Tab-separated table of C-alpha atoms and ligand atoms in Angstrom:
chain	number	residue	atom	x	y	z
D	52	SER	CA	-2.251	7.584	-33.812
D	53	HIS	CA	-0.240	10.863	-33.770
D	54	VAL	CA	-0.359	14.235	-31.907
D	55	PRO	CA	1.563	17.498	-32.480
D	56	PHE	CA	2.188	18.160	-28.762
D	57	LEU	CA	2.920	15.294	-26.333
D	58	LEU	CA	3.353	16.024	-22.612
D	59	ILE	CA	4.734	13.064	-20.585
D	60	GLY	CA	3.374	13.001	-17.000
D	61	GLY	CA	0.158	14.556	-15.633
D	62	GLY	CA	1.916	16.967	-13.245
D	63	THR	CA	1.899	20.621	-12.187
D	64	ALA	CA	4.561	21.400	-14.835
D	65	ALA	CA	2.816	19.361	-17.517
D	66	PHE	CA	-0.357	21.458	-17.108
D	67	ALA	CA	1.486	24.786	-17.058
D	68	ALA	CA	2.908	23.815	-20.436
D	69	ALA	CA	-0.472	23.027	-22.060
D	70	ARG	CA	-1.875	26.364	-20.955
D	71	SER	CA	1.129	28.225	-22.358
D	72	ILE	CA	0.979	26.346	-25.704
D	73	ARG	CA	-2.744	26.995	-26.194
D	74	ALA	CA	-2.182	30.629	-25.309
D	75	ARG	CA	0.477	31.157	-28.017
D	76	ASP	CA	-1.357	28.929	-30.554
D	77	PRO	CA	-5.131	28.927	-29.856
D	78	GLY	CA	-5.850	25.879	-32.042
D	79	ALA	CA	-3.209	23.443	-30.892
D	80	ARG	CA	-3.705	19.730	-30.262
D	81	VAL	CA	-2.195	18.783	-26.901
D	82	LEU	CA	-2.132	15.329	-25.294
D	83	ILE	CA	-0.942	14.861	-21.709
D	84	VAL	CA	-0.210	11.211	-20.730
D	85	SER	CA	-0.599	10.243	-17.053
D	86	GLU	CA	0.647	7.191	-15.129
D	87	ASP	CA	-1.617	8.522	-12.351
D	88	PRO	CA	-5.344	7.669	-12.790
D	89	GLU	CA	-6.290	11.230	-11.796
D	90	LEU	CA	-6.389	14.553	-13.600
D	91	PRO	CA	-3.889	17.386	-12.984
D	92	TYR	CA	-3.983	18.481	-9.373
D	93	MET	CA	-1.605	20.683	-7.376
D	94	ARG	CA	0.227	19.012	-4.461
D	95	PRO	CA	0.885	21.528	-1.623
D	96	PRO	CA	-2.533	21.418	0.159
D	97	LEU	CA	-2.141	17.596	0.595
D	98	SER	CA	0.034	18.278	3.637
D	99	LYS	CA	-1.531	21.549	4.884
D	100	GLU	CA	-4.979	23.030	4.091
D	101	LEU	CA	-6.792	19.679	3.644
D	102	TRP	CA	-6.076	18.763	7.287
D	103	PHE	CA	-7.309	22.115	8.649
D	104	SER	CA	-10.850	21.703	7.300
D	105	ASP	CA	-13.912	20.890	9.449
D	106	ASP	CA	-15.940	19.105	6.758
D	107	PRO	CA	-15.446	15.382	7.390
D	108	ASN	CA	-16.422	14.796	3.755
D	109	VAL	CA	-13.360	16.765	2.569
D	110	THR	CA	-11.730	13.385	1.931
D	111	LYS	CA	-14.256	12.991	-0.958
D	112	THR	CA	-14.628	16.527	-2.371
D	113	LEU	CA	-10.956	17.548	-2.164
D	114	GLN	CA	-12.233	21.092	-1.731
D	115	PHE	CA	-9.946	22.875	0.728
D	116	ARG	CA	-10.256	25.821	3.050
D	117	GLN	CA	-7.500	28.412	2.726
D	118	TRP	CA	-6.294	30.183	5.885
D	119	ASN	CA	-8.810	33.021	5.120
D	120	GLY	CA	-11.949	30.818	5.034
D	121	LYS	CA	-12.125	30.737	1.191
D	122	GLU	CA	-12.747	27.485	-0.577
D	123	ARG	CA	-10.860	26.077	-3.591
D	124	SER	CA	-10.295	22.783	-5.438
D	125	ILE	CA	-7.065	20.814	-5.620
D	126	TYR	CA	-7.699	20.137	-9.323
D	127	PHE	CA	-6.227	22.816	-11.624
D	128	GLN	CA	-9.321	22.756	-13.823
D	129	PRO	CA	-12.643	20.866	-13.947
D	130	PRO	CA	-13.124	18.061	-16.543
D	131	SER	CA	-15.178	20.465	-18.724
D	132	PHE	CA	-11.980	22.316	-19.675
D	133	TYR	CA	-10.346	19.149	-21.048
D	134	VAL	CA	-11.589	17.429	-24.175
D	135	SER	CA	-11.666	13.669	-24.823
D	136	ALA	CA	-8.717	11.654	-26.092
D	137	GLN	CA	-10.355	9.808	-28.987
D	138	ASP	CA	-11.937	12.978	-30.451
D	139	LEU	CA	-8.882	15.283	-30.063
D	140	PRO	CA	-7.399	14.894	-33.551
D	141	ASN	CA	-10.861	15.342	-35.104
D	142	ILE	CA	-12.425	18.077	-32.904
D	143	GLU	CA	-11.881	21.235	-34.855
D	144	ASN	CA	-9.522	23.976	-33.532
D	145	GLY	CA	-9.520	21.682	-30.560
D	146	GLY	CA	-8.205	21.850	-27.056
D	147	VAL	CA	-6.199	19.790	-24.593
D	148	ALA	CA	-6.958	16.159	-23.644
D	149	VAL	CA	-5.376	13.822	-21.092
D	150	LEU	CA	-4.924	10.055	-21.064
D	151	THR	CA	-5.194	8.717	-17.502
D	152	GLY	CA	-3.924	5.396	-16.150
D	153	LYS	CA	-1.173	4.933	-18.761
D	154	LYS	CA	2.632	5.006	-18.384
D	155	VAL	CA	5.107	5.977	-21.112
D	156	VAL	CA	7.530	3.046	-21.145
D	157	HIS	CA	9.791	3.858	-24.117
D	158	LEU	CA	11.052	6.965	-25.935
D	159	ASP	CA	12.394	6.703	-29.466
D	160	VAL	CA	13.979	10.097	-30.116
D	161	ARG	CA	14.959	9.633	-33.780
D	162	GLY	CA	11.525	8.131	-34.486
D	163	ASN	CA	9.605	10.965	-32.726
D	164	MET	CA	7.490	8.354	-31.054
D	165	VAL	CA	6.759	6.732	-27.674
D	166	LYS	CA	5.371	3.400	-26.485
D	167	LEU	CA	2.900	2.920	-23.662
D	168	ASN	CA	2.666	0.089	-21.123
D	169	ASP	CA	-0.264	-1.518	-23.029
D	170	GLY	CA	1.549	-1.676	-26.373
D	171	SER	CA	0.207	1.570	-27.900
D	172	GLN	CA	2.300	3.847	-30.120
D	173	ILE	CA	2.037	7.614	-30.413
D	174	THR	CA	4.146	9.733	-32.761
D	175	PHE	CA	4.626	13.441	-31.996
D	176	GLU	CA	6.022	16.705	-33.266
D	177	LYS	CA	7.035	18.499	-30.095
D	178	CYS	CA	7.474	16.673	-26.774
D	179	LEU	CA	7.854	17.632	-23.124
D	180	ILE	CA	9.079	15.387	-20.325
D	181	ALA	CA	7.560	16.352	-16.961
D	182	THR	CA	7.797	13.134	-14.995
D	183	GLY	CA	8.623	14.665	-11.603
D	184	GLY	CA	10.045	12.112	-9.123
D	185	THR	CA	9.677	9.059	-6.874
D	186	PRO	CA	9.741	9.240	-3.054
D	187	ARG	CA	12.820	7.849	-1.294
D	188	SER	CA	12.380	5.037	1.221
D	189	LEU	CA	14.503	4.581	4.331
D	190	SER	CA	17.262	1.921	4.040
D	191	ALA	CA	16.375	0.593	7.510
D	192	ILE	CA	12.832	-0.270	6.336
D	193	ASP	CA	14.013	-1.670	2.982
D	194	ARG	CA	15.843	-4.431	4.892
D	195	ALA	CA	12.993	-5.074	7.364
D	196	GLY	CA	10.291	-7.716	6.834
D	197	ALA	CA	7.069	-7.871	4.792
D	198	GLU	CA	4.798	-7.376	7.817
D	199	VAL	CA	6.837	-4.262	8.765
D	200	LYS	CA	6.416	-2.468	5.435
D	201	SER	CA	2.629	-2.881	5.354
D	202	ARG	CA	2.456	-0.182	8.113
D	203	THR	CA	4.809	2.292	6.393
D	204	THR	CA	3.581	5.230	4.306
D	205	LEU	CA	5.345	7.597	1.965
D	206	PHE	CA	3.648	10.810	1.038
D	207	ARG	CA	2.924	12.244	-2.389
D	208	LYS	CA	-0.195	11.543	-4.418
D	209	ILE	CA	-3.712	11.778	-3.071
D	210	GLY	CA	-4.070	8.176	-2.161
D	211	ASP	CA	-1.234	8.673	0.256
D	212	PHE	CA	-3.339	11.362	1.995
D	213	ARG	CA	-6.592	9.336	1.994
D	214	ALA	CA	-4.642	6.348	3.363
D	215	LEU	CA	-3.021	8.290	6.225
D	216	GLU	CA	-6.166	10.283	7.073
D	217	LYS	CA	-8.026	7.001	7.640
D	218	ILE	CA	-5.047	5.609	9.604
D	219	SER	CA	-5.228	8.837	11.683
D	220	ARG	CA	-8.616	7.961	13.220
D	221	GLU	CA	-7.779	4.264	13.626
D	222	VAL	CA	-4.559	3.989	15.675
D	223	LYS	CA	-3.072	5.597	18.818
D	224	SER	CA	0.515	6.435	17.802
D	225	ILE	CA	2.000	7.750	14.546
D	226	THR	CA	5.679	8.471	13.915
D	227	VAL	CA	7.014	10.873	11.232
D	228	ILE	CA	10.623	10.336	10.054
D	229	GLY	CA	12.362	13.318	8.408
D	230	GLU	CA	13.342	16.856	9.418
D	231	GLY	CA	12.334	18.382	6.094
D	232	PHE	CA	9.554	20.881	5.534
D	233	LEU	CA	7.076	18.216	4.458
D	234	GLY	CA	7.900	16.091	7.478
D	235	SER	CA	7.105	19.054	9.745
D	236	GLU	CA	4.032	20.175	7.745
D	237	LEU	CA	2.654	16.691	8.413
D	238	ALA	CA	3.614	16.631	12.085
D	239	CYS	CA	1.689	19.884	12.719
D	240	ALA	CA	-1.289	18.495	10.779
D	241	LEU	CA	-1.602	15.471	13.023
D	242	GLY	CA	-0.864	17.857	15.935
D	243	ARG	CA	-3.982	19.944	15.418
D	244	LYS	CA	-5.867	16.668	14.839
D	245	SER	CA	-4.496	15.430	18.191
D	246	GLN	CA	-6.106	18.342	20.113
D	247	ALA	CA	-9.435	16.479	19.661
D	248	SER	CA	-8.400	12.858	18.882
D	249	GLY	CA	-5.846	12.540	21.704
D	250	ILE	CA	-3.372	10.470	19.652
D	251	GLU	CA	0.421	10.231	19.765
D	252	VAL	CA	2.351	12.208	17.117
D	253	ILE	CA	6.143	11.761	16.961
D	254	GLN	CA	8.682	13.438	14.652
D	255	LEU	CA	12.204	11.946	14.729
D	256	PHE	CA	15.251	12.596	12.625
D	257	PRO	CA	19.030	12.334	12.803
D	258	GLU	CA	19.439	16.110	12.423
D	259	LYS	CA	19.895	18.462	15.394
D	260	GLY	CA	16.807	20.639	14.808
D	261	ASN	CA	13.826	21.019	12.469
D	262	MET	CA	14.839	21.712	8.825
D	263	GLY	CA	18.411	21.767	10.137
D	264	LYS	CA	19.951	21.282	6.697
D	265	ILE	CA	18.671	24.729	5.632
D	266	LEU	CA	17.783	26.845	8.661
D	267	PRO	CA	20.533	28.146	10.965
D	268	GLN	CA	20.727	26.730	14.483
D	269	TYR	CA	18.774	29.582	16.160
D	270	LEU	CA	15.710	29.402	13.945
D	271	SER	CA	15.917	25.652	13.340
D	272	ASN	CA	15.572	25.274	17.099
D	273	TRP	CA	12.861	27.931	17.603
D	274	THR	CA	10.945	25.910	15.019
D	275	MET	CA	11.543	22.640	16.861
D	276	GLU	CA	9.990	24.454	19.854
D	277	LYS	CA	7.079	25.733	17.767
D	278	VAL	CA	6.316	22.215	16.458
D	279	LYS	CA	6.438	20.834	20.002
D	280	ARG	CA	4.018	23.569	21.042
D	281	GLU	CA	1.499	22.320	18.429
D	282	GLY	CA	1.277	18.938	20.245
D	283	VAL	CA	4.167	16.785	18.991
D	284	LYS	CA	6.936	14.674	20.548
D	285	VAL	CA	10.064	15.864	18.696
D	286	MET	CA	13.155	13.576	18.874
D	287	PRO	CA	16.331	15.088	17.333
D	288	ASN	CA	19.618	13.116	16.879
D	289	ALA	CA	17.685	9.929	16.151
D	290	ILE	CA	19.575	7.499	13.866
D	291	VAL	CA	17.376	4.495	13.104
D	292	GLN	CA	19.224	1.189	13.650
D	293	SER	CA	16.381	-1.269	12.873
D	294	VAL	CA	12.605	-1.547	12.748
D	295	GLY	CA	10.354	-4.502	13.554
D	296	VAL	CA	6.966	-5.623	14.837
D	297	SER	CA	6.452	-6.973	18.364
D	298	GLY	CA	3.170	-7.142	20.277
D	299	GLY	CA	0.913	-5.568	17.619
D	300	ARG	CA	3.165	-2.521	17.449
D	301	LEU	CA	6.174	-1.295	15.491
D	302	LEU	CA	9.420	-0.900	17.416
D	303	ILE	CA	12.123	1.504	16.253
D	304	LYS	CA	15.597	0.655	17.530
D	305	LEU	CA	17.756	3.752	17.656
D	306	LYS	CA	21.539	3.703	17.517
D	307	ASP	CA	21.840	5.893	20.651
D	308	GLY	CA	20.279	3.071	22.722
D	309	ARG	CA	16.698	4.454	22.826
D	310	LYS	CA	13.661	2.476	21.651
D	311	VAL	CA	10.346	3.795	20.261
D	312	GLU	CA	7.058	1.929	20.198
D	313	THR	CA	4.448	3.144	17.683
D	314	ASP	CA	1.544	2.064	15.478
D	315	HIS	CA	2.391	3.757	12.088
D	316	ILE	CA	5.383	5.262	10.217
D	317	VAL	CA	5.524	7.980	7.526
D	318	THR	CA	8.867	8.478	5.677
D	319	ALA	CA	9.452	12.080	4.526
D	320	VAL	CA	13.002	11.797	3.140
D	321	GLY	CA	13.396	13.394	-0.312
D	322	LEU	CA	12.848	12.759	-3.985
D	323	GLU	CA	14.385	10.458	-6.617
D	324	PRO	CA	13.678	11.923	-10.146
D	325	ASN	CA	12.062	9.650	-12.823
D	326	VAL	CA	14.904	9.414	-15.291
D	327	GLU	CA	13.732	5.934	-16.295
D	328	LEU	CA	13.158	7.020	-19.895
D	329	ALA	CA	16.740	8.364	-20.264
D	330	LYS	CA	18.037	4.878	-21.100
D	331	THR	CA	15.621	3.851	-23.847
D	332	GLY	CA	15.889	7.246	-25.577
D	333	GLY	CA	19.554	7.761	-24.737
D	334	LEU	CA	19.418	11.116	-22.978
D	335	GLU	CA	21.866	12.578	-20.503
D	336	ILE	CA	21.500	12.485	-16.724
D	337	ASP	CA	23.367	14.761	-14.313
D	338	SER	CA	25.476	12.553	-11.950
D	339	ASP	CA	25.825	15.292	-9.299
D	340	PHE	CA	22.313	16.786	-9.027
D	341	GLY	CA	20.215	14.015	-10.670
D	342	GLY	CA	17.571	14.274	-13.394
D	343	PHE	CA	17.601	15.082	-17.113
D	344	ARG	CA	20.348	17.486	-18.232
D	345	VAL	CA	18.967	20.407	-20.237
D	346	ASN	CA	20.288	23.806	-21.365
D	347	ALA	CA	19.086	27.304	-20.392
D	348	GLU	CA	16.021	26.961	-22.710
D	349	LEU	CA	15.148	23.618	-21.014
D	350	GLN	CA	15.976	21.686	-24.202
D	351	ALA	CA	17.476	18.232	-24.202
D	352	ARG	CA	17.533	17.628	-27.952
D	353	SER	CA	15.673	18.727	-31.098
D	354	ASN	CA	12.002	18.296	-30.287
D	355	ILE	CA	12.436	17.382	-26.592
D	356	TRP	CA	12.294	19.618	-23.543
D	357	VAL	CA	12.197	18.893	-19.798
D	358	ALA	CA	10.653	20.816	-16.880
D	359	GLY	CA	9.677	20.593	-13.229
D	360	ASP	CA	11.406	18.480	-10.593
D	361	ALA	CA	12.795	16.134	-13.256
D	362	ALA	CA	14.809	18.861	-15.000
D	363	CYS	CA	18.419	19.582	-14.244
D	364	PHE	CA	18.718	22.939	-16.005
D	365	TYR	CA	21.260	25.759	-16.471
D	366	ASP	CA	20.662	28.973	-14.549
D	367	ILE	CA	23.177	31.461	-15.983
D	368	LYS	CA	23.220	33.608	-12.789
D	369	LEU	CA	23.553	30.802	-10.264
D	370	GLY	CA	24.933	27.869	-12.349
D	371	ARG	CA	23.703	24.365	-13.095
D	372	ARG	CA	20.841	23.467	-10.765
D	373	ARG	CA	17.877	21.286	-10.014
D	374	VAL	CA	14.922	22.313	-7.862
D	375	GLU	CA	11.811	20.663	-6.487
D	376	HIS	CA	9.490	23.607	-6.114
D	377	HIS	CA	5.914	24.227	-7.110
D	378	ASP	CA	6.600	27.732	-8.394
D	379	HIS	CA	9.345	26.166	-10.542
D	380	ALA	CA	7.094	23.480	-12.022
D	381	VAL	CA	4.751	26.326	-13.040
D	382	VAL	CA	7.221	28.854	-14.510
D	383	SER	CA	9.514	26.239	-16.117
D	384	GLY	CA	6.552	24.328	-17.599
D	385	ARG	CA	5.116	27.605	-18.958
D	386	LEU	CA	8.429	28.616	-20.610
D	387	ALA	CA	8.969	25.105	-22.059
D	388	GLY	CA	5.565	25.499	-23.704
D	389	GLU	CA	6.609	28.800	-25.275
D	390	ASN	CA	9.779	27.167	-26.670
D	391	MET	CA	7.791	24.222	-28.072
D	392	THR	CA	6.042	26.890	-30.157
D	393	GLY	CA	9.421	28.375	-31.224
D	394	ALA	CA	10.009	31.242	-28.740
D	395	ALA	CA	13.529	29.945	-27.984
D	396	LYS	CA	13.800	31.781	-24.662
D	397	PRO	CA	16.188	31.312	-21.730
D	398	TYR	CA	15.056	30.595	-18.151
D	399	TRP	CA	15.770	34.020	-16.576
D	400	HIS	CA	13.270	33.628	-13.698
D	401	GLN	CA	14.230	32.673	-10.133
D	402	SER	CA	11.909	30.031	-8.658
D	403	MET	CA	10.615	30.360	-5.073
D	404	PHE	CA	9.566	28.116	-2.212
D	405	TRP	CA	7.119	28.554	0.707
D	406	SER	CA	5.890	26.567	3.707
D	407	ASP	CA	3.153	26.901	6.345
D	408	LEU	CA	3.155	25.244	9.798
D	409	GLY	CA	-0.420	26.067	10.800
D	410	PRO	CA	-1.855	29.497	9.884
D	411	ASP	CA	0.400	31.117	12.529
D	412	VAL	CA	3.878	30.373	11.008
D	413	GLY	CA	5.239	30.720	7.418
D	414	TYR	CA	8.537	30.652	5.480
D	415	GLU	CA	9.447	32.069	2.029
D	416	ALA	CA	12.738	31.033	0.239
D	417	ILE	CA	14.632	31.948	-2.983
D	418	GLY	CA	18.018	30.872	-4.370
D	419	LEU	CA	20.872	28.893	-2.790
D	420	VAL	CA	20.013	28.033	0.818
D	421	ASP	CA	22.161	25.814	3.038
D	422	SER	CA	23.135	25.572	6.739
D	423	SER	CA	26.735	24.898	5.711
D	424	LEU	CA	27.147	28.276	3.959
D	425	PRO	CA	28.015	31.315	6.093
D	426	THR	CA	24.863	32.953	7.382
D	427	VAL	CA	23.669	36.332	8.610
D	428	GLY	CA	20.260	36.665	10.250
D	429	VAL	CA	18.488	39.901	11.153
D	430	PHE	CA	15.395	39.694	13.367
D	431	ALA	CA	12.617	41.802	14.845
D	432	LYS	CA	9.402	41.514	16.820
D	433	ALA	CA	6.446	40.316	14.669
D	434	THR	CA	3.241	42.424	14.307
D	435	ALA	CA	-0.412	41.532	13.754
D	436	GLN	CA	-0.144	41.079	9.954
D	437	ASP	CA	3.078	39.023	9.989
D	438	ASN	CA	1.647	35.506	9.583
D	439	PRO	CA	0.196	33.406	6.726
D	440	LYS	CA	-3.478	33.870	7.769
D	441	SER	CA	-3.178	37.676	7.697
D	442	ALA	CA	-1.235	37.582	4.450
D	443	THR	CA	-3.842	35.283	2.815
D	444	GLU	CA	-6.551	37.789	3.817
D	445	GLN	CA	-4.880	40.188	1.421
D	446	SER	CA	-4.620	38.260	-1.849
D	447	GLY	CA	-5.814	34.899	-0.609
D	448	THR	CA	-4.222	32.107	-2.612
D	449	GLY	CA	-1.336	29.614	-2.752
D	450	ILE	CA	1.442	32.120	-3.433
D	451	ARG	CA	0.771	33.160	-7.107
D	481	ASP	CA	11.116	38.144	21.806
D	482	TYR	CA	11.563	37.784	18.013
D	483	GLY	CA	8.763	36.730	15.631
D	484	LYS	CA	10.018	37.536	12.142
D	485	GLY	CA	13.265	38.009	10.301
D	486	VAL	CA	15.399	37.502	7.225
D	487	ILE	CA	18.337	35.163	6.582
D	488	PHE	CA	21.020	35.929	4.010
D	489	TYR	CA	23.065	33.034	2.655
D	490	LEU	CA	26.228	34.281	1.059
D	491	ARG	CA	29.559	33.549	-0.657
D	492	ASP	CA	32.222	36.345	-1.020
D	493	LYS	CA	30.098	38.958	0.829
D	494	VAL	CA	27.502	38.788	-1.958
D	495	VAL	CA	24.046	37.281	-1.452
D	496	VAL	CA	23.200	34.052	-3.349
D	497	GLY	CA	20.184	32.719	-1.340
D	498	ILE	CA	17.542	34.225	0.984
D	499	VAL	CA	15.126	32.849	3.583
D	500	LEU	CA	12.257	34.875	5.020
D	501	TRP	CA	10.664	34.073	8.360
D	502	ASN	CA	7.069	35.382	8.571
D	503	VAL	CA	7.723	38.195	6.067
D	504	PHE	CA	5.303	38.272	3.132
D	505	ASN	CA	4.896	39.921	-0.284
D	506	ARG	CA	8.486	41.044	-0.297
D	507	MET	CA	9.699	38.280	-2.608
D	508	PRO	CA	10.173	40.573	-5.663
D	509	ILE	CA	12.711	42.549	-3.578
D	510	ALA	CA	14.586	39.361	-2.721
D	511	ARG	CA	14.713	38.428	-6.430
D	512	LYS	CA	16.258	41.807	-7.280
D	513	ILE	CA	18.939	41.375	-4.579
D	514	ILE	CA	20.121	37.992	-5.869
D	515	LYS	CA	20.092	39.002	-9.554
D	516	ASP	CA	22.027	42.227	-8.815
D	517	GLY	CA	24.479	40.403	-6.508
D	518	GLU	CA	26.678	43.277	-5.251
D	519	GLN	CA	29.191	43.493	-2.337
D	520	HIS	CA	26.676	44.576	0.305
D	521	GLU	CA	28.581	46.322	3.104
D	522	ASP	CA	25.972	46.483	5.898
D	523	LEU	CA	23.391	43.680	5.865
D	524	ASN	CA	21.503	45.619	8.539
D	525	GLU	CA	20.712	48.218	5.897
D	526	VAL	CA	19.708	45.541	3.431
D	527	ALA	CA	17.309	44.082	6.010
D	528	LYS	CA	15.474	47.446	6.178
D	529	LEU	CA	14.169	46.533	2.720
D	530	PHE	CA	12.041	43.756	4.353
D	531	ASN	CA	10.826	46.045	7.168
D	532	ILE	CA	13.295	44.720	9.780
D	533	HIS	CA	14.676	47.185	12.408
M	1	FAD	C1	2.748	17.015	0.059
M	1	FAD	C2	3.507	17.989	-0.796
M	1	FAD	C3	3.600	19.311	-0.397
M	1	FAD	C4	4.296	20.230	-1.166
M	1	FAD	N1	4.362	21.505	-0.732
M	1	FAD	C5	5.024	22.427	-1.439
M	1	FAD	C6	5.104	23.825	-0.979
M	1	FAD	O1	4.568	24.186	0.084
M	1	FAD	N2	5.775	24.696	-1.732
M	1	FAD	C7	6.378	24.338	-2.892
M	1	FAD	O2	6.991	25.213	-3.566
M	1	FAD	N3	6.345	23.063	-3.370
M	1	FAD	C8	5.701	22.085	-2.710
M	1	FAD	N4	5.650	20.772	-3.210
M	1	FAD	C9	6.341	20.438	-4.464
M	1	FAD	C10	5.468	20.449	-5.714
M	1	FAD	O3	4.204	19.802	-5.559
M	1	FAD	C11	6.216	19.717	-6.807
M	1	FAD	O4	7.420	20.439	-7.067
M	1	FAD	C12	5.375	19.621	-8.070
M	1	FAD	O5	4.472	18.525	-7.900
M	1	FAD	C13	6.277	19.438	-9.290
M	1	FAD	O6	5.536	19.282	-10.492
M	1	FAD	P1	6.016	18.176	-11.557
M	1	FAD	O7	4.985	18.051	-12.659
M	1	FAD	O8	7.440	18.489	-11.969
M	1	FAD	O9	5.995	16.801	-10.676
M	1	FAD	P2	4.642	16.001	-10.258
M	1	FAD	O10	3.629	17.062	-9.904
M	1	FAD	O11	4.951	14.878	-9.285
M	1	FAD	O12	4.100	15.318	-11.611
M	1	FAD	C14	4.637	14.124	-12.172
M	1	FAD	C15	3.486	13.266	-12.675
M	1	FAD	O13	3.849	12.587	-13.878
M	1	FAD	C16	3.631	11.187	-13.733
M	1	FAD	N5	4.671	10.376	-14.419
M	1	FAD	C17	5.956	10.196	-14.050
M	1	FAD	N6	6.613	9.385	-14.914
M	1	FAD	C18	5.731	9.031	-15.855
M	1	FAD	C19	5.763	8.194	-17.066
M	1	FAD	N7	6.919	7.585	-17.402
M	1	FAD	N8	4.623	8.067	-17.799
M	1	FAD	C20	3.477	8.690	-17.453
M	1	FAD	N9	3.387	9.476	-16.358
M	1	FAD	C21	4.455	9.679	-15.534
M	1	FAD	C22	3.629	10.924	-12.240
M	1	FAD	O14	2.808	9.800	-11.902
M	1	FAD	C23	3.090	12.207	-11.666
M	1	FAD	O15	1.671	12.104	-11.580
M	1	FAD	C24	4.952	19.803	-2.441
M	1	FAD	C25	4.848	18.463	-2.834
M	1	FAD	C26	4.153	17.553	-2.052
M	1	FAD	C27	4.063	16.125	-2.487
């Protein structure tokens, strides 16, 4: 068979593309192809809102409670929206179908055709690659035995949540490895769970403080203290020597002489993009940043675009980049869909990131953020509406004595990245400040733009 629009991967970016195509051309035939057996679902609530629900059948519905009491589904759309695969070419002025449980194992660029794992062959006219990425495993655990790995989770797709949620009510001690935002989002999840279950939740990492690769020492620490406060044993400066089983329990040997005894391990340590198809089709990978190299219009070659986590693209303001955001998967995927219908537009939009550690703490981020860069923070006492619960009350979604502040990351006294600590709805102002990029003289005056005095 054949289809005029072929989206590889069933992701957040892959969906955003199909919506944007069918908006510009209301009769288009679109076929997503998913390795995953499940239909397009957003990822963020897997580590946050789905733990803070009181329905014990949430595991089955996947209907979450936002911080404002509202309900929502993890699935982007119901299965009524989508049409069937077999009847897509035939159904007249038809919609958008998806082919679950099938992996695209070869790309023939000059043939405008792909092969699937089962031997199938689909030709196409326009094609998107939106494969996302594979979770990294810890080199300590790679070396360890077979018995050791059977108690080690990675976190990404739903099954990983269902797995760990069951494990949560079964054992006494669970250890989270990684200082990243996901690592911490998960620690605070088990933390609230621990207030009733009385289990042991440990977060350990080689870094000095929580999110210490991005946040400056003052806030990185404050956050370490805030995560502790939520019922967690935080262990900074932990370099894992070796891991093994002994006496029905895992034992983590640290390089600094300490030893940890626990029942289960979750590894939250970054993302390896799925550039597996780059060989067979002969497309270019970026050796620095990783992923598929594409231009400012997200194009790899004639008839092939790439978006989401998997896309190393060219921002003209900031330079060549690659980002693993949700907002990015959405906006990039949407643009790529416009270009597949001829719009030939550049990626002028600046993607944004957010995180929530309970409904009492929240971070917003845009641009180039890094602890290594020189940093200026401006802080002030937080008020009643400065928290993610109170902000969700207002719009109520998934982002369409100091308590709050702003952090400028800079290079030549001109701002190139921004982090916001419990300051909400002021993202459009941060976007303006990066795009403009002037020689700001007093960053105290710039902070007044985020209501910081
Ligand atoms: C727990 C969690 C929490 C997160 N929280 C936040 C947050 O708070 N804020 C934020 O901005 N971002 C967050 N993210 C990031 C966001 O979910 C990702 O950036 C988003 O999933 C990217 O969309 P994507 O389509 O590019 O990748 P994905 O959504 O991973 O989609 C890729 C899909 O394509 C499939 N695929 C891959 N290769 C093939 C192939 N060869 N053939 C067929 N199918 C294939 C994969 O199986 C996968 O299902 C979070 C992610 C996770 C996992």
